[PDB]
Design a protein around this ligand. Sequence first.
Ligand code: HEM
Length: 82
Amino acid sequence: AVKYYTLEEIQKHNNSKSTWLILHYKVYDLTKFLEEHPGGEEVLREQAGGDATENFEDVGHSTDARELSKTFIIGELHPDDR
Ligand code: HEM
C-alpha cells in the first residue's frame, strides 16, 4: 500500500515540531534529521512544507545521500496535486 498526502496537508508541517518536504513526488519527514544533515538545518527549514526537488538536485547529492534519504519517506504526493 502507499499513503498519499495533499499539498495542503504537507504545508502544515513546517514548525519546530515537524518538518516535511517533497522530493520527486515523495514526502519525507526530516524532523529528526535536521541536526545530522551535513548541509545544515537552515537549508532544510527554508524548504519545509514544500517541494525542494530542484534545490536538492542543484547541489547534486551523492549516491550515499540518496540511499539514506529513502529511510525518511512516509508517502507520496497525491496524484491530483501533481
Ligand atoms: C532528503 C534528505 C537529504 C539527505 C539524506 C541529505 C544528505 C546530505 C549529505 C549526506 C550531504 C553530504 C554530501 C553528499 O553526500 O552529497 C549533504 C549536503 C548538502 N545538502 Fe543535503 N540531504 C538531504 C536534503 C537536502 C535538501 C532538500 C537540501 C536543499 C534544500 C540540501 C542541501 C544540502 C547542501 C547545501 C549540502 C552541502 C553541499 C556543499 O558542501 O557544497 N540537502 N546532504
